[PDB]
Amino acid sequence: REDAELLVTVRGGRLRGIRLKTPGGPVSAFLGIPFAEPPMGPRRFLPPEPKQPWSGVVDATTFQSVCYQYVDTLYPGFEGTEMWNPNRELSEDCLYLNVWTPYPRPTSPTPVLVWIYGGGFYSGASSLDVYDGRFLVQAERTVLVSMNYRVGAFGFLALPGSREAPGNVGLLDQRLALQWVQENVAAFGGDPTSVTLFGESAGAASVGMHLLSPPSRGLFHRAVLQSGAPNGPWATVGMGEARRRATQLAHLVGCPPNDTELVACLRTRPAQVLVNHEWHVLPQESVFRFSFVPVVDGDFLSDTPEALINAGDFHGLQVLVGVVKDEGSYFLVYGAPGFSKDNESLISRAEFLAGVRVGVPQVSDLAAEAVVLHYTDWLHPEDPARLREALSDVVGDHNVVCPVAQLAGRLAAQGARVYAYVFEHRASTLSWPLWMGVPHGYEIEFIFGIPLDPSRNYTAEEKIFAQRLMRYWANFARTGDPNEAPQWPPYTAGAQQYVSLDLRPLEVRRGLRAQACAFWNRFLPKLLSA
Amino acid sequence: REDAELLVTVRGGRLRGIRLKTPGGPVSAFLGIPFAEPPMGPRRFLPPEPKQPWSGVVDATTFQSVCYQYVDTLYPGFEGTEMWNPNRELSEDCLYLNVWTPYPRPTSPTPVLVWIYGGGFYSGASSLDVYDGRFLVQAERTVLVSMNYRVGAFGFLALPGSREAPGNVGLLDQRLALQWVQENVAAFGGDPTSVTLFGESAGAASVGMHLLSPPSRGLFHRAVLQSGAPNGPWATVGMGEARRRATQLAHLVGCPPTGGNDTELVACLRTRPAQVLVNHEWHVLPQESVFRFSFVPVVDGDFLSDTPEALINAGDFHGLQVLVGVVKDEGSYFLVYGAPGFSKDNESLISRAEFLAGVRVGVPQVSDLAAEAVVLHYTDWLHPEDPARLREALSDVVGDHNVVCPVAQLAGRLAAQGARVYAYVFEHRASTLSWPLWMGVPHGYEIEFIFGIPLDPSRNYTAEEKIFAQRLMRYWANFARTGDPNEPQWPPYTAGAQQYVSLDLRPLEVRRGLRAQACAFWNRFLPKLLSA
Numbered sequence A: 001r002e003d004a005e006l007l008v009t010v011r012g013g014r015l016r017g018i019r020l021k022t023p024g025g026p027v028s029a030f031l032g033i034p035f036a037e038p039p040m041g042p043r044r045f046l047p048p049e050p051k052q053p054w055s056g057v058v059d060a061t062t063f064q065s066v067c068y069q070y071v072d073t074l075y076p077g078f079e080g081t082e083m084w085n086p087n088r089e090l091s092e093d094c095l096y097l098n099v100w101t102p103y104p105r106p107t108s109p110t111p112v113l114v115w116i117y118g119g120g121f122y123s124g125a126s127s128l129d130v131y132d133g134r135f136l137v138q139a140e141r142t143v144l145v146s147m148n149y150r151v152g153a154f155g156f157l158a159l160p161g162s163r164e165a166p167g168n169v170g171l172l173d174q175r176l177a178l179q180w181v182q183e184n185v186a187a188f189g190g191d192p193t194s195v196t197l198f199g200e201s202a203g204a205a206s207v208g209m210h211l212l213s214p215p216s217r218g219l220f221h222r223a224v225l226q227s228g229a230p231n232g233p234w235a236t237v238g239m240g241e242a243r244r245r246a247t248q249l250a251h252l253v254g255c256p257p258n259d260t261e262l263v264a265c266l267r268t269r270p271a272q273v274l275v276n277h278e279w280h281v282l283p284q285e286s287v288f289r290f291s292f293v294p295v296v297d298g299d300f301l302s303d304t305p306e307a308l309i310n311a312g313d314f315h316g317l318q319v320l321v322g323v324v325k326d327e328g329s330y331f332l333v334y335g336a337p338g339f340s341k342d343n344e345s346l347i348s349r350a351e352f353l354a355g356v357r358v359g360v361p362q363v364s365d366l367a368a369e370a371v372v373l374h375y376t377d378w379l380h381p382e383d384p385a386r387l388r389e390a391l392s393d394v395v396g397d398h399n400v401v402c403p404v405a406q407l408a409g410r411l412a413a414q415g416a417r418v419y420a421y422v423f424e425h426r427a428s429t430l431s432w433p434l435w436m437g438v439p440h441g442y443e444i445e446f447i448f449g450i451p452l453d454p455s456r457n458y459t460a461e462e463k464i465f466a467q468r469l470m471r472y473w474a475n476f477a478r479t480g481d482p483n484e485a486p487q488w489p490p491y492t493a494g495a496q497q498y499v500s501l502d503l504r505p506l507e508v509r510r511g512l513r514a515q516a517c518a519f520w521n522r523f524l525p526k527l528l529s530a
Numbered sequence B: 001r002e003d004a005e006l007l008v009t010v011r012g013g014r015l016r017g018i019r020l021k022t023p024g025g026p027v028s029a030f031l032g033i034p035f036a037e038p039p040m041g042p043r044r045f046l047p048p049e050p051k052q053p054w055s056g057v058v059d060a061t062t063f064q065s066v067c068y069q070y071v072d073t074l075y076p077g078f079e080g081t082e083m084w085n086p087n088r089e090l091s092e093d094c095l096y097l098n099v100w101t102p103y104p105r106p107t108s109p110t111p112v113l114v115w116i117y118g119g120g121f122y123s124g125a126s127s128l129d130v131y132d133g134r135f136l137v138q139a140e141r142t143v144l145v146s147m148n149y150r151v152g153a154f155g156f157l158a159l160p161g162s163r164e165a166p167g168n169v170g171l172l173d174q175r176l177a178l179q180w181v182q183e184n185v186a187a188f189g190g191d192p193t194s195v196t197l198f199g200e201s202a203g204a205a206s207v208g209m210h211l212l213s214p215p216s217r218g219l220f221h222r223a224v225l226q227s228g229a230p231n232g233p234w235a236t237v238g239m240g241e242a243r244r245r246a247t248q249l250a251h252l253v254g255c256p257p258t259g260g261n262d263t264e265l266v267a268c269l270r271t272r273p274a275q276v277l278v279n280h281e282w283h284v285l286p287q288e289s290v291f292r293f294s295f296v297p298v299v300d301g302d303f304l305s306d307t308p309e310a311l312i313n314a315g316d317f318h319g320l321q322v323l324v325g326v327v328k329d330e331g332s333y334f335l336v337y338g339a340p341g342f343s344k345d346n347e348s349l350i351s352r353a354e355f356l357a358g359v360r361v362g363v364p365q366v367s368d369l370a371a372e373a374v375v376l377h378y379t380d381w382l383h384p385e386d387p388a389r390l391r392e393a394l395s396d397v398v399g400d401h402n403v404v405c406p407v408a409q410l411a412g413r414l415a416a417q418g419a420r421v422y423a424y425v426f427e428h429r430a431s432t433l434s435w436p437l438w439m440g441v442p443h444g445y446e447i448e449f450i451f452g453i454p455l456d457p458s459r460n461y462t463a464e465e466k467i468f469a470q471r472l473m474r475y476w477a478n479f480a481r482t483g484d485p486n487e488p489q490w491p492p493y494t495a496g497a498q499q500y501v502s503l504d505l506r507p508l509e510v511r512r513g514l515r516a517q518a519c520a521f522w523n524r525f526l527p528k529l530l531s532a
């Protein structure tokens, strides 16, 4: 009758899962497991509370609701943007996690991968097709866990010092899920002593912040940061600016009639009302800037991530970090003047100079001049194709590449063993224009083995590539070393060695854009202080 | 009795010259013509006064004295440094000029080349062997003129506003010599309506300042600036810093028994022996540095109504032809005079710490932030500690900051504002060069080829270098005659295409960009950083 492999008892009660099909065999999935009380009504903006025990059997056969978030409408119906939009109904009752295990369930402790999705801390969901864990679990025989966490104002609105809206509760949602993994993953066959965190963009920034927060450190053992870092200029906000943004949001939604009255009024508004106004609390026009992000208030982060990275002892830590070939191109169509996915975006010098202030917001004119000096080819100062690639480099280096390069350099120089990559394969199914190259976020589908889905149109070569990348990632989760063949050397602050990931065998190189990142990481901070 | 070819009457009186032998035939030389009253005693620091007329015949038959100046002591007996030291006795009685003309004297008016030597405004002389004008006149049949002008404190000590030491008198010496050319060069067969100034280093900066001073602008028609520009960070000084340096120099020599009344301060300075002033001249510089000189032209609203940069940016230069250029390694020569770890006698493979310390020596008197901006751009962050790369990088720092980027900025603005510009880079290392190999083609070592020194038979240049020298003399003379060095073609320099030619044994090769990336930092960004 009923498959005993799909019945699991966790600390809170009983669950019923579903058997999933994959080209290489079945997989056990437990989707929509509640790990927190629904953060609704008076519980909104508050830290999550552990889910109370239940009687009966929870149906864990389908994904649960997506946390309330903005839905992108720039190119309606376009696959390049719809693949990131919510594929389930929106709700504040969204604190659920998902578990994939081999079928039948492992009888021996199995290494655990925990996925934290990205989306600028304002969007994302564990239920997106591109995060389907069935292929990783079947091919590499790990336990895969992913959780939903609150985004936008619901997860990161902060009136610092107030208890009604302390901030960082979305990060606490992630920590609660990691604590749930420690207490319950063995019931699925997972090994709670071998937990690897991996995430992309804001998910990678989240992974980095769990590395720098002592209460989260005991919950995992290895970390993978893809196209993101906690020291990115978009990843955190100071207490003063957080209070300003929280206050303006209240004003824009008709609040208030102290912090208590302000939060109480915010709690009376429908969730969609807060979503409709959250982008308007940003101080200026920009790309790669987000309204409600983690706040540095001395609690979750006792100091800025950059400060915590410099003062940290990282011996015994192994981290896998990397970027895609063209980190900046995706963001240019959301505000940079002259850009669009439907033409070549061959911009003029005037549009380039205007894009610099959009891509590098909230800096002095002198700082902007330094950017223009560094990213101008003064033998071809007005060539539109060069200007298009240059502004993509500005946005990509400033927000992703150089923050990741700095994290990798400091971690390596202070005990950690770092492996660095650059993902350089443009998917044959990529629907973005060719000038965007390999855009932000389009390595994920290969890490998750999506090309193995036979109902998709990836090539035979791309399937072998996905299997290669799944092996690297799983090798790292098992041993802290992706290697098995051309060897992948560790990244060091001196040699700065990394590998390129594409259809060709591994190629070792030096320097994660060393010349450009010396500007962003070494000189520009000095310029802004004086 | 006499040779009429060697007798000339100028406005001041009669002159007698000499007939010089050259590998290609005779040349008339009138060496040591007085063009000003000796600036001695009460006239020290004063503007030059026209030479009073004389009766009889002045023998203009040999070079006159070198103006009082410092004598380099760093590598005694070394050919590389002794070639720039005085080859005549030092004297304040030094305001004499020289005229070379073809033998026999030209039938028709001939274009005139006027040479202004360099030496950081503290040294130099028209009598140096490398400035011998006989080969240019023989090969290209022009009239060549060179003059001595006061250097160091005697030419550029400035108490601005005062009448006893108004400053810039060395530039006034040059202008007086230019006025002399206008009134008298026709007696030698020269055309006063076709006068081409050319100079190197501080001489090139001098040429540019005459371009930007209206009283001088009417005295010539074309300009050549070799490895120098008036907008260089070393070429001018503000009124306040000039007064500070002049006051500390007076204080260092006991004047007066600091500052005070200007008339009495200078009167005390006039009682000091010339050598005493020279001995303390370098002590007034604010910090340890290279390519910085104590007494230089002062921007005081008179000779220079504004900074050279502002005058360049506001200037209308239609109808002007200009030839500018640099050598391949402008900075290397200056590093052995103070940069830590450097020497002509070893490889100068410096460390990272010596590189950072040399940056402050090579870019003196800037904020810590500006210094780190220099480090950011001249460090290869894949090889931040490689000694050979650091040695080249510090050479580039000093060369770009002081020569290449000032010249590139001068060339770009003149071209954009009406002038026709031709740019070169001199890339030949002479076979006779005595400096070590790591210095490449150093500052000042294109001059000997422009003056045709390789044609001197007692020298040891190769036959290839003699052909090269004759080719360069043709470019310079073509430009002096027509405003165009051509007749492989040499395209003009423009702000957009930024085209220049390489001068070496190979034929002309057209390139783009006078180190465009580096000079965008020095000319565009760094000024914004200093004002904020």
Ligand SMILES: *[C@@H]1O[C@H](CO[C@@H]2O[C@@H](C)[C@@H](O)[C@@H](O)[C@@H]2O)[C@@H](O[C@@H]2O[C@H](CO)[C@@H](O)[C@H](O)[C@H]2NC(C)=O)[C@H](O)[C@H]1NC(C)=O
Residues within 6 Å of the ligand: B260, B261, B262, B263, B264
């Ligand atoms: C500074 O002093 C000069 C005069 O220089 C000498 O020292 C003076 C104290 C006096 O002894 C002069 O005779 C010496 O020549 C001043 O200029 C003189 O001023 C007087 C009175 O007006 C006049 O009769 C002289 O002709 C002037 N001689 C010149 C032009 O040198 C000058 O005014 C003083 N400036 C100050 C106040 O600092």
Ligand SMILES: *[C@@H]1O[C@H](CO[C@@H]2O[C@@H](C)[C@@H](O)[C@@H](O)[C@@H]2O)[C@@H](O[C@@H]2O[C@H](CO)[C@@H](O)[C@H](O)[C@H]2NC(C)=O)[C@H](O)[C@H]1NC(C)=O
Residues within 6 Å of the ligand: B339, B340, B341, B342, B343, B345, B346, B347, B348, B349
């Ligand atoms: C090359 O020499 C320089 C400076 O030194 C002089 O020339 C040398 C060839 C040798 O003859 C020395 O005895 C001379 O003093 C070295 O850099 C300097 O080293 C001296 C050591 O006293 C010291 O002043 C500073 O550290 C450096 N700067 C100077 C010029 O004072 C350089 O290290 C030598 N190159 C090597 C070591 O290969």
Ligand SMILES: NC(=O)c1cc[n+](COC[n+]2ccccc2/C=N/O)cc1
Residues within 6 Å of the ligand: B070, B071, B072, B084, B122, B123, B278, B279, B280, B281, B282, B291, B333, B334, B337
């Ligand atoms: N008046 C002085 O004491 C003095 C001291 C030092 N210097 C400059 O040092 C020598 N130098 C430094 C750099 C380039 C060339 C030279 C050679 N000059 O003859 C000039 C004057």
Ligand SMILES: NC(=O)c1cc[n+](COC[n+]2ccccc2/C=N\O)cc1
Residues within 6 Å of the ligand: A072, A084, A118, A119, A120, A124, A200, A201, A286, A287, A288, A289, A330, A331, A334, A439, A440, A441, A442
């Ligand atoms: N205006 C913006 O900066 C912006 C930011 C983010 N997005 C949507 O990002 C979707 N996304 C979400 C998660 C991970 C990656 C990605 C992007 N490309 O792969 C649109 C506009």
Ligand SMILES: *[C@@H]1O[C@H](CO)[C@@H](O)[C@H](O)[C@H]1NC(C)=O
Residues within 6 Å of the ligand: B458, B459, B460
């Ligand atoms: C040039 O070389 C020759 C042969 O060695 C020598 O006799 C002569 O003195 C040298 N002259 C110069 C200028 O060096």
